[PDB]
Amino acid sequence: NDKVYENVTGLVKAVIEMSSKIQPAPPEEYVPMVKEVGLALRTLLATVDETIPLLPASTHREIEMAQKLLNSDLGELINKMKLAQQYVMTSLQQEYKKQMLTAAHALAVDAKNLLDVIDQARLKMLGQTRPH
Ligand SMILES: [Zn+2]
Ligand SMILES: [Zn+2]
């Protein structure tokens, strides 16, 4: 029920959408799908930034690296999309589209890991407060 949880769920659903839809899709159709995955990521990353000030200092780094990795899954997905758009109406089409899928799949997996690191940081956070 937390904003981080919601943003991850959003980002994963955009990935599953694009995934189930990309086989029979022209660039016209799959650019927007990548555009949606992109902003859902940007949104999650903004939320995680607003969250770090509440998590223990000792967890900052693990979380920061998890965000870097998502940022380059995006970069990797965007690159595979550019290439699919270049080799449209050819037989490098399917190959590049399959590479987009892989890259989106990585992004979803890395989003969940980030959720898991933030969740564990929150648990460690409970073990820290002072009396009233
Ligand atoms: Zn959607
Ligand atoms: Zn009190």
Q: What does each C-alpha distance from 73 to 58, 67, 69, 104 come to in angstroms?
A: 25, 10, 6, 7
* Cβ atoms 75, 31 nearer than 8 A: no
| Spacing, Cα 20 to ligand 1 middle (Å) | 12
Integer Cα distance of 121 and 61 in angstroms:
11
User: Taking each helix axis from N to C terminus, what angle separates 3-21 and 27-51, rounded to the nearest 10 degrees?
Assistant: 160
Give the method used. X-ray
Integer Cα distance of 25 and 18 in angstroms:
10
| Spacing, Cα 131 to ligand 2 middle (Å) | 8
Domain count, the chain: 1
Task: Quote the distance between the C-alpha of residue 94 and its chain's center.
Answer: 23
| Spacing, Cα 51 to ligand 1 middle (Å) | 25
Question: What is the stated resolution of the deposited model, in angstroms?
Answer: 2.2
| Spacing, Cα 128 to ligand 1 middle (Å) | 39
* Cβ atoms 110, 73 nearer than 8 A: yes
Q: What does each C-alpha distance from 31 to 7, 12, 69 come to in angstroms?
A: 21, 17, 22
* Cβ atoms 15, 30 nearer than 8 A: no
Strands (E), the chain: none
| Spacing, Cα 85 to ligand 1 middle (Å) | 21
Q: What domain range includes position 55?
A: 1-132
